[PDB]
């Protein structure tokens, strides 16, 4: 109620719009819209109290995974890594279309508890590449 309130959030059937409170982040999926395909939310819409756990679909990747929004204070190094590894991960055929040597090894040095594995996982999730941990 507080989030739809003063909002008129645009909403289409199937979206995963997320709500946050009580020191936890839960997202509610709209499964049915009486008119279709999308609609605005209004304060004059009666509300429905169900609260049932339908399990998430397999194909979608959960919101648990880290993104660039979860990391702040290392903008320069993150930008460097992004510009360095955007092409090979998302455009593999090109590097076969031109004669050039991409990097295949990177080292990150810093004190512990700085979010290095966090950065690696964030990049892996943000580019869709497979991730392996050792």
């Amino acid at each position: 109620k507080p989030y739809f309130l003063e909002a008129y959030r645009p909403i289409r059937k199937g979206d995963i719009f997320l709500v946050r409170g009580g020191m936890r982040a839960v997202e509610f999926k709209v499964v049915e819209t009486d008119p279709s395909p999308y609609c605005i939310v209004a304060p004059d819409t009666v509300i429905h109290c169900e609260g049932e756990p339908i399990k998430r679909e397999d194909e979608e990747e959960s919101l648990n995974e880290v993104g660039y929004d979860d990391i702040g204070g290392c903008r320069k190094q993150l930008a460097q890594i992004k510009e360095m590894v955007e092409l090979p991960l998302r455009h593999p055929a090109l590097f076969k279309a031109i004669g050039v040597k991409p990097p295949r090894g990177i080292l990150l040095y810093g004190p512990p508890g700085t979010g290095k594995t966090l950065i690696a996982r964030a990049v892996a999730n943000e580019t869709g590449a497979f991730f392996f941990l050792i």
Partner: protein
């Protein structure tokens, strides 16, 4: 000693099929810079090249790059036979064709750029 054969050695030019002779040899081979010359090579193969003139190279050493050496199978220090061919005759669309199993980034119209 039957001055028909001659040694092969490196060349400075970037272009293909160009042999640079030692200048003191003009009228012995009798061919100038406007004449193409046939060079023999192993497993019964040959090539034909236009010629340049330079001073620094040694008398017994033709200068020719890798592309024109490999088909001759000639390896540096080996000796090949040079004979003038003023009888050159033009061709009509020699058929030319890419080599190897595949070419990286290869598609479309490569002839307007690479030929």
């Amino acid at each position: 000693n039957r001055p028909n054969r001659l040694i092969v050695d490196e060349a400075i030019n970037e272009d293909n099929s160009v042999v640079s002779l030692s200048q003191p040899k003009m009228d012995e081979l009798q061919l100038f810079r406007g004449d193409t010359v046939l060079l023999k090579g192993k497993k019964r193969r040959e090539a034909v090249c236009i010629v340049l003139s330079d001073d620094t190279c040694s008398d017994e050493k033709i200068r020719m790059n890798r592309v024109v050496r490999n088909n001759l199978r000639v390896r540096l220090g080996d000796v090949i036979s040079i004979q003038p061919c003023p009888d050159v005759k033009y061709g009509k669309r020699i058929h030319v064709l890419p080599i190897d199993d595949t070419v990286e980034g290869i598609t479309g119209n490569l002839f307007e750029v690479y030929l």
